[PDB]
Amino acid sequence: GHMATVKKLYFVPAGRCMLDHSFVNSALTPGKLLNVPVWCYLLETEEGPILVDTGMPESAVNNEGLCNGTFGEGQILPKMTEEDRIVNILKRVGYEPDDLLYIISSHLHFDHAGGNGAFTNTPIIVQRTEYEAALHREEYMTECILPHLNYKIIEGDYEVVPGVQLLYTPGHSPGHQSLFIETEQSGSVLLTIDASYTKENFEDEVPFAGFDPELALSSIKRLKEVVKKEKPMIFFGHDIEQEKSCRVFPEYI
Ligand SMILES: [Zn+2]
Ligand SMILES: [Zn+2]
Numbered sequence: 001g002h003m004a005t006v007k008k009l010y011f012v013p014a015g016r017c018m019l020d021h022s023f024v025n026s027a028l029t030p031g032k033l034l035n036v037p038v039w040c041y042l043l044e045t046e047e048g049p050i051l052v053d054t055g056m057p058e059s060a061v062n063n064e065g066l067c068n069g070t071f072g073e074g075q076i077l078p079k080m081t082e083e084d085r086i087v088n089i090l091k092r093v094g095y096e097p098d099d100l101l102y103i104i105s106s107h108l109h110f111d112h113a114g115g116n117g118a119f120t121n122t123p124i125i126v127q128r129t130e131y132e133a134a135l136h137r138e139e140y141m142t143e144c145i146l147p148h149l150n151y152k153i154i155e156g157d158y159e160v161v162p163g164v165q166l167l168y169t170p171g172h173s174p175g176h177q178s179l180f181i182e183t184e185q186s187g188s189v190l191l192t193i194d195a196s197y198t199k200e201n202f203e204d205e206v207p208f209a210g211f212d213p214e215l216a217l218s219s220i221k222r223l224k225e226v227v228k229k230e231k232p233m234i235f236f237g238h239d240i241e242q243e244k245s246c247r248v249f250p251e252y253i
Pocket of ligand 2: 109
């Protein structure tokens with residue numbers, strides 16, 4: 001109870017998503033799709049296992065056309081098989097939903113909270129501003145904001161357990177949050193999540209898809225201050241190049 005660090009941080013592939021390249025660089029003219037990774041993260045901690053995000057909804061399985069009839073039509077195409085349903089991922093890894101200590105929702109976009117309905121008992125940690133936006137903004141799916149789950153609504157920065165900190169990073173979505181994790185093997189790790197899809201969104205401040213790009217920039221600024229102080233390893237949300245060098249399950253950091 002001694003532990004200031006998490007035992008293991010796993011990067012867990014949870015399917016993929018086609019995004020128009022204008023999502024990763026808002027200046028690009030639409031018309032080329034990128035097959036970007038979708039992630040969830042598994043933390044093995046002294047208090048129990050913690051899952052960060054829950055993949056895509058069952059409606060996306062074998063259904064690349066999910067975003068027909070919406071703003072995302074032809075620009076967002078989920079790449080999800082039956083194997084990528086979060087319960088299946090978890091079962092292969094070694095867990096059932098009720099085994100988890102917490103779920104952390106970085107935000108409620110379909111590629112992060114599609115699986116939330118699987119977890120009916122586990123507290124789901126989500127920002128108030130994200131929860132309230134999800135009750136109306138139309139980039140949100142029904143599946144991402146089911147009414148009777150055990151939500152643990154928080155406001156701003158928050159310590160989940162020792163070694164697991166949430167950093168409020170709104171802009172990509174109204175209540176987006178990133179993670180700062182201290183691991184036994186690696187020390188300080190910053191999971192930007194979608195506060196930057198790619199390394200150039202972060203380092204070069206290349207604009208990318210978001211609810212409020214001005215806020216997204218300030219959140220990036222704030223992360224840069226944390227980086228200056230902590231010098232962490234930094235992992236981006238939907239980065240095909242960085243993915244190439246990521247250690248992924250069963251490897252951990
Ligand atoms: Zn998102
Ligand atoms: Zn995302």
